[PDB]
Amino acid sequence: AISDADLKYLRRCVDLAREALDDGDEPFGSVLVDHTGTTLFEDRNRVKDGDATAHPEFAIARWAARHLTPDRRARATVYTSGEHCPMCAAAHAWVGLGRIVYATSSAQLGGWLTEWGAQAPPVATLPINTVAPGVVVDGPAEELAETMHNLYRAKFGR
Amino acid sequence: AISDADLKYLRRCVDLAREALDDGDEPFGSVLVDHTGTTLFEDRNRVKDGDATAHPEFAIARWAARHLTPDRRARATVYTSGEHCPMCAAAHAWVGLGRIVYATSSAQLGGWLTEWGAQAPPVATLPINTVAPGVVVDGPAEELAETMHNLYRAKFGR
Numbered sequence A, B: 001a002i003s004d005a006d007l008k009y010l011r012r013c014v015d016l017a018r019e020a021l022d023d024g025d026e027p028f029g030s031v032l033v034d035h036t037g038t039t040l041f042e043d044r045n046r047v048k049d050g051d052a053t054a055h056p057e058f059a060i061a062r063w064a065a066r067h068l069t070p071d072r073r074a075r076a077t078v079y080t081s082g083e084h085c086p087m088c089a090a091a092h093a094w095v096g097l098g099r100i101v102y103a104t105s106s107a108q109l110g111g112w113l114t115e116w117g118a119q120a121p122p123v124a125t126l127p128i129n130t131v132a133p134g135v136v137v138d139g140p141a142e143e144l145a146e147t148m149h150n151l152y153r154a155k156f157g158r
């Protein structure tokens, strides 16, 4: 299963996804943590002003390219409530970030959308390693499945 | 179906790729065209200052989300010298842009890189529609294969 320390940062990601929903946005949150265990950057979706590319994982990738050396990026971890879409997985790989840990997979998300009769996203729900074959990926976290099911249903399952 | 008009925009993308090469960057160029035929935005790779996500197709997607209505985006066309990487294909789909026309495929680039012993991209060379299933895609343009091979050789040959 997932480490206890990893699960604590995933719970922070879920809290960020809840912040996003409560601000009229989509429930996706992500945290960048360095190899010392220091949180460097936290973000959530910001698509409500009209830019559907406003994903936290992408913001993290550009922040890392700006602020961190290649060595430091490679040793950092990105935690996310939901597995990176292909945009974000590719951006992560381009900048040379390290491990990804997700609470819920894109397989879970896509399966729930179809359960609810909801439209699929306009991007295929490709696993990270289809897009970015070298990235170390862990998840999902069983303890957080129900919570994320309920967040996603609130936004996308009406 | 690559019309004479399409080839003209592709040639402009080649010119933008060469601008990038001559500025110390990588030879990738892209143009956003309104359905009325007006060029809206032009760009090329800007990765030399350390951000490997600085691709023109991505810049086009974010510019389009900032400046164009959804209806205008849907009717716009993106031309590119090189087929979108997954990052850029996904961004295009997220913002709801229209048709993509490319001069050279990402399979062609990948094959040329391998022949040079150049470092493969850390992203898979997925065709656009693997990432963005609903996007209308045309390309490659045989007339521009050699020209692009030569530009790529200038940057990545060894």
Ligand SMILES: Nc1nc(N)nc(-c2ccccc2)n1
Pocket: A026, A028, A045, A055, A056, A082, A083, A084, A085, A086, A106, A109, A121, A123, A124, A125, A126
């Ligand atoms: N951050 C984010 N926002 C949305 N709306 N969807 C996604 C997503 C993640 C993986 C696959 C497909 C969509 N990611």
Ligand SMILES: Nc1nc(N)nc(-c2ccccc2)n1
Pocket: B026, B028, B045, B055, B056, B082, B083, B084, B085, B086, B106, B121, B123, B124, B125, B126
């Ligand atoms: N714009 C661009 N820049 C680079 N360095 N590589 C690409 C690329 C396109 C398709 C697949 C893989 C890389 N695109």
Ligand SMILES: [Zn+2]
Pocket: A055, A057, A058, A084, A085, A086, A087, A088, A089
């Ligand atoms: Zn994303």
Ligand SMILES: [Zn+2]
Pocket: B055, B057, B058, B084, B085, B086, B087, B088, B089
């Ligand atoms: Zn790209």
